[PDB]
Amino acid sequence: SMNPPAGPVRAIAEYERSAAVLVRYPFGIPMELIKELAKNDKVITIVASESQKNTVITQYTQSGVNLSNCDFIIAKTDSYWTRDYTGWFAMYDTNKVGLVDFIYNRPRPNDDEFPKYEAQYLGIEMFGMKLKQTGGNYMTDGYGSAVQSHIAYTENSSLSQAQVNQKMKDYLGITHHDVVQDPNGEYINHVDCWGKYLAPNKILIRKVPDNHPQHQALEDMAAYFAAQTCAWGTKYEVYRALATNEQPYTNSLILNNRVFVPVNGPASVDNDALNVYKTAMPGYEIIGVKGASGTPWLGTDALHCRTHEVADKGYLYIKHYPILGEQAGPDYKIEADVVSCANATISPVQCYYRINGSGSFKAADMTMESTGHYTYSFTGLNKNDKVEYYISAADNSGRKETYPFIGEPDPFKFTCMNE
Ligand code: NA
């Protein structure tokens, strides 16, 4: 149809559950990456024909790829930049997952048309957002914020900024459309070359040497996010990836509990970048990925550019705003909504918690107050007690999710003040 999705709408972040990752043949990524992806996750390869599918299967077989995780879509494409032209994922109508198409900002008509084939393959509805856009220049936090470089306005110059913002609201549920002047001084003007939400409360911002012409622009961008309150109510934790030689360290893919970071030398500088991700993202497996010789990583074009995560059409979605830091009390009540996009019965919904840092986390059932709305109150806590917690839900489709996504390795933390 030509109508927007039935509300409310919520754009899905890259660090939410992914059912698959989308790549394209002829390839722009190394076979070793496809192999590593397929070890744990479904890889959907776009090919132009049944014969081309079989050519790819032969290559996957010869390279030892886990074929049980290899799926295919037959559709014409112009390029391997699946980040930039494939559809964007949003929840809509309470418990549905949909795809949002847009006008691809390149003269690549098969790439531009592709989202319809993606939606057909996935068995989900598609909605047409009439803005000139590109996925590389888009990221959302999963709480209604999105960051883009200035081309989101300048390539839609027949519309006012308000009209552009309204399109993002109507099709993606974006209420905070954070469009900024690109700090990189290069042609592409994509956020994924300088910035990446790692979680709702964490953002990675590129850093360069002091004498690099973009040094101050990037420091200013880091300061901007550090001063900004995030969706959870704390200031963003701002992490920095130092590019000594224009290495594309922010151009990584978060796929479930793994992070794939392009590396292109020197080894020590690559390892420093990987260390930043490891520090920022406890519990995640951080994986450095060397480029393919024929289609190497570039400063403006690397791993994030040549992949796109695919949301779970049956997503078990946990909506939660955490209790953090010094809390007054005397009640410490957490609330979460849990929705099954699989239309499955949800049970159990639990709070896992630990008090004052020792022993194992303990499970307590949350109380369902109304349909899909769960609460839990921490009892018996004394002044200055430290609480770690996370939420866990399961349904009878076999889905199991925590909030935060990674669960126990990175729990929410608060302190009981009793004041
Ligand atoms: Na399109």
Author numbering: 47 to 465
Provide excerpts from the study:
To this end, citrullination by the only known prokaryotic PAD expressed by keystone periodontal pathogen Porphyromonas gingivalis (PPAD) has been implicated in the aetiology of RA. PPAD is organised into four domains: the N-terminal signal peptide (NtSP, aa 1-48), catalytic/deiminase domain (CD, aa 49-360), Ig-like fold (IgLF, aa 361-463) and C-terminal domain (CTD, aa 464-556). The CD adopts the canonical fold of ββαβ motifs conserved among GME structures (RMSD 2.0–2.4 Å). The PPAD active site is an elongated cavity with its entrance exposed to the surface exterior.
We have determined the 1.46 Å and 1.48 Å structures of tPPADWT and tPPADC351A by molecular replacement, which reveal identical and superimposable conformations (root mean square deviation (RMSD)∼0.09 Å), suggesting that the Cys351Ala substitution did not perturb protein integrity. Difference Fourier electron density maps clearly reveal an active site-bound ligand, modelled in the tPPADC351A structure as an arginine-containing dipeptide, and in the tPPADWT structure as an amidino adduct where its Cζ atom is covalently linked to the Cys351 S atom. The acidic residues Asp238 and Asp130 serve to fixate the arginine guanidino Nη1 and Nη2 atoms by ionic interactions, thereby positioning the Cζ atom for a nucleophilic attack by the Cys351 sulphuryl group (as evidenced from the Cζ-S thioether bond in the tPPADWT structure). As expected, tPPADWT only produced citrulline from Gly-Arg. The truncated form of PPAD secreted from P. gingivalis lacks the N-terminal 43 amino acids and CTD, and so has similar N-terminal/C-terminal boundaries to our tPPADWT construct.
